[model samples]
Target chain A: QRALAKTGAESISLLELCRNTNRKQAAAKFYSFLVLKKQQAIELTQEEPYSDIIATPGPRFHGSLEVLFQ
Target chain B: GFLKLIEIENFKSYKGRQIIGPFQRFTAIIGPNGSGKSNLMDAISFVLGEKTSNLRVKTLRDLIHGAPVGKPAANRAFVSMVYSEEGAEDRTFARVIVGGSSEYKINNKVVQLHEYSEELEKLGILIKARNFLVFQGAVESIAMKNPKERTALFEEISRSGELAQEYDKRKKEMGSGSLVPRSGSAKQAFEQIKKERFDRFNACFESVATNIDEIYKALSRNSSAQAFLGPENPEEPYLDGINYNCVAPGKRFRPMDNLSGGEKTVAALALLFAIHSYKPAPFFVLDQIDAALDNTNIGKVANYIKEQSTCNFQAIVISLKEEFYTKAESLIGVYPEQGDCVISKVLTFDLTKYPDAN
Candidate 1:
């Protein structure tokens, strides 16, 4: 999710929360993973506690998701 | 002027010391393949400070003779050539290639390449011009060169290439105002120098161009062909406005490409001789320039060389054709012996004694 935010994605996929809040939390969590594992990681915020987050469609969102997965 | 002698030791195909010539005005070298005829030419090139590539080698070490099978390879190579002008003392120029280093000498006195080249220049041998040496297929290459390049050939032969270069340098300097002051008297002086250089270049160009045209006409008299310099016919698609054209009997003037192979060869030979006539060198070394020419054309080239040798320069040619060799004032036979060593033997023949000599 942080990688996607760094790629200038506007919104998080399948999130009911505010886009800004999700990006802020995603960046904090990603930084936390980097600190704990001594490597880069991106942690996305899910829409619900136990629900799947479908990737947004369109070239830009798909490209952002590709980077997120990568 | 003449090449009095060429001595080589452990230089490609020649394992031991060998002396090749006290060459005459017109000398021919003939031998079977692998007999080291071309090696002799390379020896000359080496002594003259030609590049390793021109000697058909990749490096200086490659010039050293590698012995056959179990034999020991030579550690170094040496070549020396003596030049004798009619009224001047003989000068011996030598070259030694050892390990990874090379050395040059004049009259046994160690000298830099520049000093040796200066001495050669005094004897009318300018390595930069490179007009004094003609290798196999070189004529065709010259004939096939573009118009501008062909024009530059005449300029080089006339010794105007240097002047033209100087003129260009001065023009650039004047334009940039780097070396010259932008003042009244100095500006006038620089302008004067530039004009004189331009005039000198133009004068040389015209003189050599006319000389070449006249010589080509004489050489191709039988065929009634002529060579000229001008723009190609306007009806043609492209016109650079500067081209070398050949006009044959009953044919309009056309670019060199329109001429047949034999005619082109003849024209090329004429241009070469014309260059020699304009600025004669101490001597010239050629390798099979008649490879594509027939018996009659070969005779024409040989005769032209002989005629020019009388007043212009000595010619040392390596040829396999009989017609070319028979007309030579002196003949050299290079052959390999049973010992796997190559040697050159001077053979004397009487041209009057052989009706088929020509």
Candidate 2:
């Protein structure tokens, strides 16, 4: 996640994001992933019925870091 | 830098072979007339690549030691010297004179005189400062040297002599009418070249001149004296030469010629020391520098060298005075031996053993 934030790429295998997207959009996606990961880690530490205030992946999930099993 | 050893064969005043040194930081050479004391210094100069004329002889054959009246003259002579720098490999320089031709070699590989000189220069041994071999009577003569010559000497020491030479060459080229402008472009090219050369010349001259001025001013301030160096022609800047003026307390600034012998010596020594301060060599060989100096001035010069040698370069001085020799850490007594060969006896004085000697 720290590497993604610095290099604007999700991971070594996902370097296509850096090549396909503009520099500003790639940086925005990397930072948004970092924010979501931190919020998810905090949400896991909290009890049940905690507020789900963070945004989730939509239909076009280009910015998501979740692995696709299909 | 330090001299490791010097070997001479068939050189002036020495009939056979002789080896001297493995010298120390502060070495003094002492001997009476005809004892080959000066010859040893000359040998160092010869191996370090001084010109034949600087060896005080016109012909190369004159440097060769001729046999006695009943014997044949030697055909060749050579001098070899080894120098060592801290944490570096030893460098050997040798010069051989045979039948009016001289050959220079570095570690036994023959090289051109120019190449040898350049290599020596890279090692911090320059011929410009009297070929790094100051001779007898040089000190007083430097004191009495003409302003033009003195300025030129300073320029050479400061490494600006080449700039001045280039400036002169360019000026001559611009004035020689060789660039006959047939077209506007040709005239423009000529003007552009002249402008560039002129700017470079002025910039180089000013930088060097400013450095010399600062050195002279600082030296004078330290010694409680006053002096000035500037261009001779203010109206046409580059058209004239440089002027040096020495000022007495209550009197107007006077040319160097108007100064007394002692005053001149002091000023000259100050300038020499100043130059060294700016661009110091690894070692300096000064001969009879105290001849023109009085007790107080001599002490000042000795103390200066002592202080400088502590952290800066090594110095090998040849002097007749005990005051100067006593300050040396090592002494080389050069004496004429039987059969007209010269031998040098080295004596290393332990400063710890003679703590009160100073």
Candidate 3:
């Protein structure tokens, strides 16, 4: 307890983290990061028109799980 | 309606006039050395463009009779072939006469050589002046060719007239020198024309590509059919399954070229049968086509030929073997006298005579 500079260093449990920031909130943040990276890659490549054509999909994503992970 | 009868006169060993055929289901032209068996086959091939210059005939005069010292040179040689379609009323005869030049007559009326060739191809009697028809000693040549060339031959056999036309068109385009440069509106017009032409060419080629696909399909179907009919032993299926290389669902199987001699023969026969099935000809001629096969394969070949005969296309096979003779509906023995041929015997095929046969 003598080591704390700002406040006291708290022992945070998994339940407390989830309660403060829901799983959906964390997932949304990660998804936003992925979208930003994808946009950056597309812009850097200078293949915007082709990238737009590629990004458009059917009513649902019709791709393999591997492609999704990639 | 292929070639019902052929009359040869002053043509190599056929010094005097001789008519061969009125062919039944199957025919055999058997004879010893210099018997003009090969000469008779050559006569038909020569009319189809087998010339001395073409390496099909040894010399320009090889097709002509050797003139006696006192007699004048016989400058003329002719082959008159009579063809009757299976369901046609009239017998059409095409007389191809060659002297210093070549000439043709259909139904005793004059016609052009190009037209004759076109008519023959349309009737399914395609005769290629180059690698057109496979004759004796040519089967081994096919074995020597690379897989691409072998497949090319199969494709040519499957789609002749269409392929020939496409090849001619491509040649015409290639012959025209490089594209000329233009500017502004002229350039735009040129681009439009070029695009239109290229689009048309692509469309035509795509249609022919469909035939290539069919060839691959036929090859696959035949391989599976053969495997299913192979052996009862448990290991046989596994070996066949492995050898077939058709692991992926709906993917075609094409056997490798390093097949056994019997297997190769069967494969070739199967390809020929498949092509015939797709594009049925009015008549077909085989000169000792089964000489490469062994006993078991020979039986398979015989059955296949018999099966094809049931279709409208009439098949005439020439062989020296007594085994095939029993299967032949029409039998002809070529007799060599000096350097000419004499037809010995012609008999009708009787399946009752060979009861165990198909």
What RMSD, rounded to one decimal, does every model reach?
Answer: 29.7, 29.7, 34.3
Supply candidate 3's per-residue lDDT for B191. Answer: 44
On residues B153-188, what C-alpha lDDT tens digit does candidate 1 reach at each position? 645544545666555555555555456534555456
Q: Which stretches of candidate 2 lie over 4 Å from their true place?
A: A1-70, B67-76, B98-100, B128-131, B154-223, B234-239, B247-255, B340-352
Per-residue error (Å), model 1, residue B123: 1.3
Query: How does the DockQ of candidate 3 come out?
Result: 0.00
Clashing pairs in 2: B127-B131
Worst 10 residues of 1 chain B by lDDT: B233-242
- Per-prediction DockQ comes to 0.00, 0.00, 0.00
Taking the tens digit of each residue's C-alpha lDDT, what string does model 3 give over B189-275? 544544444444333333333343333334333423332211122221111111111111143434435555544544544434434
Best by lDDT: 1
Score candidate 2 by DockQ. 0.00
* Superior by lDDT: candidate 1 or candidate 2: 1
lDDT of 2 at B213: 42
Q: Global lDDT of each model?
A: 0.62, 0.58, 0.46
Q: Candidate 1 at residue A15, lDDT?
A: 26
- Top candidate, metric TM-score: 1
